[PDB]
């Protein structure tokens, strides 16, 4: 499957995840928390080693909101955009819907809120791989591939300046 070694090219080396634990599920959404940072900063951490830094996320106390900033560099030039979505109840099993609220209404492959469109390949991927991926996937594999189509299209429609 060119699938499947696409997949493991862009997430071989990010942490894969445990617990099967949403937002109500006490000590085991701690546990699954701890796995979701562990996650992140790993692929935070390869990508600073790759010149791709191109996120930063937080989240409130309890792990259900999670908001920050990407960037993407475009003929040199480097786009901000802020972040943001909330965990399901029924996470991990369901993937999170990710916002770029900036970009609400400025182009077709996003629905109201600036919720990006994820592909009906992200989707059923995430699906077969519950509940290994987490939100450093999310990232890698949801926001990273809109990006790279999404903001040098803008960018010429003249849709998004610098």
């Given at each position: 499957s060119m699938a499947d070694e696409a997949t493991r090219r862009v997430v071989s080396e990010i942490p894969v995840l445990k617990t099967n634990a949403g937002?109500?599920?006490r000590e085991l959404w701690v546990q699954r928390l701890k796995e979701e940072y562990q996650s992140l900063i790993r692929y935070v951490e390869n990508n600073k080693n790759a010149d791709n830094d191109w996120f930063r996320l937080e989240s409130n106390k309890e792990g259900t909101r999670w908001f920050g900033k990407c960037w993407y560099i475009h003929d040199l030039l480097k786009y901000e955009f802020d972040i943001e979505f909330d965990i399901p109840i029924t996470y991990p099993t369901t993937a999170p819907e990710i916002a770029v609220?900036?970009?609400?209404?400025?182009?077709?492959?996003m629905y109201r809120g600036g919720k990006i469109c994820l592909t009906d390949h992200f989707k059923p991927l995430w699906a077969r791989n519950v509940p290994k991926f987490g939100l450093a996937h999310l990232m890698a594999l949801g926001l990273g591939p809109f990006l790279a189509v999404e903001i040098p299209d803008l960018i010429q429609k003249g849709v998004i300046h610098h």
């Open positions: 937002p109500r599920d609220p900036e970009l609400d209404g400025k182009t077709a492959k």
